[PDB]
Amino acid sequence: XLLVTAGLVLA
Amino acid sequence: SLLSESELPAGISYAEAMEGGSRPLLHPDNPVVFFDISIGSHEAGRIKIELFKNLAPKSAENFRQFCTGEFRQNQVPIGYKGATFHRIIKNFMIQGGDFVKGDGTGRLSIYGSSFPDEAFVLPHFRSGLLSLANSGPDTNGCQFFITCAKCDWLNRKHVVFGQVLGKESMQVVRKIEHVTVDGGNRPRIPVTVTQCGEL
């Protein structure tokens, strides 16, 4: 999807 | 805590921000910092950023020190000078600030390994806002993103803590946003903060 994470980018 | 668009404070509309110079618009004591950006080896221009100390003081100060070189580990400065933008998604956002590893895994703050979410006052209501990247609740570190569109689905999960100032700043953001990326949204040619500091 459209997230802003730090390490495992998710959907 | 989250403000609706109709209840936003003065000084943070897109038009207002684009009229900005080098002084803060939201609150007079907010710091203004900058990045000079290189795309490959080519100077792309400057992004000036107001940090919303009035609303998100911990988040603002963390970012500010990483810009100025004031934060040390065993007397060695560390921060955004030489940091890259590692994840760029057209029409969404540009993400960077992983000076630890350069790949999105890095987490370090001036307060320790991480710091908690401050109040979620501002929404992700437009392009040109600075917000904290994280790995879920209370996991802020060094990474950030600059919005390239409204992204209100991120509200109450990421602290919006600044805004870019002036037209050149947004032009640089748009340039970064449109570089060629691989299938994992990593730029094919590096995008680097070559200089940074406080105005």
Author numbering:
A (entry chain C): 1 to 11
B (entry chain A): 13 to 211
Reproduce text from the manuscript describing this model.
pmcCyclophilins (Cyps) are ubiquitous and evolutionarily well-conserved proteins first recognized as specific cellular receptors for the immunosuppressant cyclosporin A (CsA). These proteins are endowed with peptidyl-prolyl isomerase (PPIAse) activity to catalyze trans-to-cis isomerization of peptide bonds at proline residues, which is a critical step for correct protein folding. Herein, we characterize the functional and structural properties of a conserved (TgCyp23) and a more divergent (TgCyp18.4) cyclophilin isoform from T. gondii. While TgCyp23 is a highly active cis–trans-prolyl isomerase (PPIase) and binds CsA with nanomolar affinity, TgCyp18.4 shows low PPIase activity and is significantly less sensitive to CsA inhibition.
There are two monomers in the asymmetric unit with an almost identical structure (RMSD of 0.109 Å for the Cα superposition). The overall structure of TgCyp23 follows the folding observed in the Cyps family and is composed of a β-barrel of eight antiparallel β-strands with two α-helices on the bottom and top of the barrel, all connected by loops. As observed, the Cyp folding is preserved, with main differences in TgCyp23 related to the 40 extra residues in the N-terminal region. The residues constituting the binding pocket are Arg99, Phe104, Met105, Gln106, Ala145, Asn146, Ser147, Gln155, Phe157, Trp165, Leu166, and His170. Stabilization of CsA is performed mainly by polar interactions and van der Waals forces. Trp165 residue, located in a 310-helix in the Lβ6β7 loop, is crucial in CsA stabilization due to the formation of a hydrogen bond between its NE1 and the carbonyl O atom of MLE-2 in CsA. Gln107 plays a very important role in the CsA packaging since it both establishes a H-bond interaction with CsA and acts as a bridging residue in a H-bond network that stabilizes the proper orientation of nearby residues Arg99 and Gln155. Interestingly, this pattern is preserved in TgCyp23, and the same polypeptide substrate nicely accommodates into its active site by the direct superimposition of CypA onto TgCyp23. Both the hydrophobic pocket (Ile101, Phe104, Met105, Ala145, Phe157, Leu166) and the catalytic arginine (Arg99) are conserved as well as residues in the H-bond network, providing a substrate-binding site with similar shape and dimensions.
